[PDB]
Design a protein around this ligand. Sequence first.
Ligand SMILES: O[C@@H]1[C@@H](O)[C@H](O[C@@H]2CO[C@@H](O[C@@H]3CO[C@@H](O[C@@H]4CO[C@@H](O[C@@H]5CO[C@@H](O)[C@H](O)[C@H]5O)[C@H](O)[C@H]4O)[C@H](O)[C@H]3O)[C@H](O)[C@H]2O)OC[C@H]1O
Ligand code: NA
Length: 153
Amino acid sequence: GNVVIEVDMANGWRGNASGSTSHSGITYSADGVTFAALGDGVGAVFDIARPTTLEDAVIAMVVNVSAEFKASEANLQIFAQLKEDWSKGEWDCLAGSSELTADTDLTLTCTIDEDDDKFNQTARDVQVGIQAKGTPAGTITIKSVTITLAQEA
Ligand SMILES: O[C@@H]1[C@@H](O)[C@H](O[C@@H]2CO[C@@H](O[C@@H]3CO[C@@H](O[C@@H]4CO[C@@H](O[C@@H]5CO[C@@H](O)[C@H](O)[C@H]5O)[C@H](O)[C@H]4O)[C@H](O)[C@H]3O)[C@H](O)[C@H]2O)OC[C@H]1O
Ligand code: NA
């Protein structure tokens, strides 16, 4: 089959802010990575080390969303972007509030597919993560992230 990358859930993560609200970092636990969903654009990220062949790759995240997050009606966006060339990215993935629940774990997926093949490249690390969108509250826990490339292993 294809190349499968299993992301380390005990090292290498950071809080992230892509909007007008500052983040409060991340917290590691036996269950994975958790962040406080303080506002629109607040999330959690890690880096895929260069070089990358990420076009047509599938990102799958197992997550748990808190009751307060579900009540806030905010959405969840898996995204990826070129580190230090931030506007160049994959911005078309979204899980809306209506499809989330606080009652069980969920698997959210995102396919990277850019018309200019920006994600097949050697120059930059790629920042990948998940962020809240809208007017959020509560917390988000990431248990695992698995990336399946469009390349034979
Ligand atoms: O359909 C089209 C859509 O594709 C389009 O979506 C918009 C795409 O652009 C999005 O905005 C980007 C969000 O992410 C930002 O990156 C931030 C930059 O800041 C970084 O944090 C810095 C890290 O470095 C430190 O030194 C510094 O202290 C920190 O501030 C952070 O890690 C990145 O995530 C990009 O800069 C933005 O361009 C936008 O939200 C989408 O709506 O919309 C148009 C539509 O036609
Ligand atoms: Na929950």
